[PDB]
Nucleic acid binder design. Structure first.
Ligand code: NA
Length: 247
DNA sequence: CAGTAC
DNA sequence: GTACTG
């Protein structure tokens, strides 16, 4: 077909963006069959293709809830003090959701540990996680999983599921990042930056030293933020409900 | 870099 | 904006 439409068709594969699409085009590929049969695929790219149709589909809010509950149960079977919160556009209150993002913490602040690995394994045994895309054990005290799940039953679609385990001391800044929106986060962060601060999914910091050209050359002190409201407060911002963060 | 998460 | 792995 015409260039722009096939670049589109290719870019909707998870793991492939505009550079990969163009390369595939120059190879002569024009269809998804062309891709699965001739193209070099990362493991994740092969998964995105396998679930191409399902991944373009959005789910009802209800279905997200069901997904969060599946994750919640499995974790609580490990510790019931574990706090599990679906975030994302779901938290924001959207009718539909493109994926599901589940945040997991423990109030006692110690016990979120050793949960991540056993939680995924549990979900796999159930038949719930069907494929895995990415795992991060390398972000401090936060553990992140990107995978694919499917609820039990007839006529269920595969869904994109993120699971994140954070320590209670970071629960607030993490909750802020996973609820979003993405445009909302740039705004908070850019703002913090103008105020000599910095915001991440780990913590809000003050006394962040930047140099002449604006670049960050020293971190600051991390300010304790036990609640989302605290972050907003310390940035001189009227607190906003998740539903008001959908920018 | 490329792609991804929000 | 901040930050992870492919
Ligand atoms: Na894509």
């Amino acid at each position: 077909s015409e260039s722009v439409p096939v670049l589109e068709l290719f870019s909707n594969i998870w793991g492939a963006g505009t550079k990969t699409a163009q390369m595939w085009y120059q190879q002569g590929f024009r269809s998804l069959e062309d891709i699965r049969s001739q193209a070099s695929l990362t493991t994740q790219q092969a998964i995105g293709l396998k679930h191409y149709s399902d991944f373009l589909e959005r789910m009802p809010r209800e279905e997200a809830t069901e997904i969060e509950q599946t994750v919640q149960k499995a974790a609580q079977a490990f510790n019931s003090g574990l706090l599990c919160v679906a975030c994302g556009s779901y938290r924001r209150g959207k009718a539909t959701c493109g994926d599901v993002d589940v945040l997991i913490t423990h109030p006692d602040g110690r016990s979120h540990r050793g949960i991540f690995s056993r939680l995924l394994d549990s979900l796999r045994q159930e038949g719930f996680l069907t494929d895995d895309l990415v795992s991060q054990e390398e972000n401090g005290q936060q553990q992140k999983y990107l995978g694919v799940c499917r609820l039990p039953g007839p006529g269920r679609r595969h869904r994109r599921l993120d699971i994140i385990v954070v320590p209670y001391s970071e629960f607030a800044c993490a909750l802020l990042y996973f609820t979003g929106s993405a445009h909302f986060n740039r705004s908070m962060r850019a703002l913090a930056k103008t105020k000599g601060m910095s915001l991440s999914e780990h913590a809000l910091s003050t006394a962040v030293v930047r140099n002449t050209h604006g670049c960050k050359v020293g971190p600051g002190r991390v300010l304790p933020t036990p609640t989302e409201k605290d972050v907003f407060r310390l940035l001189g911002l009227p607190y906003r409900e998740p539903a008001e963060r959908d920018w």
